[PDB]
Design a protein around this ligand. Structure first.
Ligand SMILES: C[S@@+](CC[C@H](N)C(=O)[O-])C[C@H]1O[C@@H](n2cnc3c(N)ncnc32)[C@H](O)[C@@H]1O
Ligand SMILES: [Zn+2]
Ligand SMILES: [Zn+2]
Ligand SMILES: [Zn+2]
Length: 217
């Protein structure tokens, strides 16, 4: 099997909805570290603490703010698409990744719950194959047709990555972050049961984890 084709996008395509968070969180009290060399808003950050990215024009740390990862597309660069046992295609990293590190934004079309169920009737044959993540209050990020390499990341009952919902300039967007340190050649995975949507067509899980749950979704 050849990999699924899709329309690569650099950012989310908003169709019929706006997943506005309800706050432009601004202005932490992080102190700008004195030499340009080092990066700020690291752990104590009043923005980070609530999963909000800082805004470039209010943040006391200016260009050393490391809390604007998704807005600046600070995607890792060593992802490879590969043929992955019986899971079809997967994504692995070519170089070690550290716990908590941002990996990539998960990109797609942002549609309402309704619109996704139409696509599912009119186009998808009532199975999305987990090419879609819940975003917020009935909105869905649909990567079945448009997205980025993150759509190829497989499920594991013992995931080494997770999806996080961030408020970014007043809009919910979703990052993949490492849950644990990872060496080169490691396949990326996250728990679809937590992050993905309602699809009642369950599928057998091949994650191969001692305590695998046997089924996905
Ligand atoms: C969101 S797509 C991921 C990429 C997909 N493997 C491909 O080739 O394009 C999810 C589909 O991949 C496969 N898959 C992902 N994780 C799996 C797992 N843990 N066990 C069995 N199949 C899995 C299933 O066919 C699932 O519906
Ligand atoms: Zn800060
Ligand atoms: Zn900041
Ligand atoms: Zn499993």
């Amino acid at each position: 099997a050849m990999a699924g084709s899709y329309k690569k996008i650099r950012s989310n395509v908003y169709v019929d909805v706006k997943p506005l968070s309800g706050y432009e969180a601004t202005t932490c009290n992080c102190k700008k570290p004195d030499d340009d060399t080092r990066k700020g808003c690291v752990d104590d950050c009043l923005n980070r603490m609530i999963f909000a990215e800082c805004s470039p024009n209010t943040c006391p740390c200016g260009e050393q703010c490391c809390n604007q990862r998704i807005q600046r597309h600070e995607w890792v660069q060593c992802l490879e698409r590969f043929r992955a046992e019986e899971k079809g295609w997967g994504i692995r990293t070519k170089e070690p990744l550290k716990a908590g590190q941002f990996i990539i934004e998960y990109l797609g079309e942002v549609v309402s719950e309704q619109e996704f169920r139409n696509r599912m009737i009119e186009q998808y044959h009532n199975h999305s194959d987990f090419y879609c993540l819940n975003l917020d209050s009935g909105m869905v990020i649909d990567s079945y047709r448009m997205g980025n390499e993150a759509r190829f990341i497989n499920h594991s009952c013992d995931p080494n990555c997770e999806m996080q919902k961030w408020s970014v300039n007043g809009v919910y967007r979703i990052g993949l972050y490492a849950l644990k340190d990872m060496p080169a050649g490691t396949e990326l995975t996250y728990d679809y049961n937590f992050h993905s949507f309602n699809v009642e067509k369950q599928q057998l899980c091949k994650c191969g984890f001692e305590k695998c749950r046997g089924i996905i979704g």
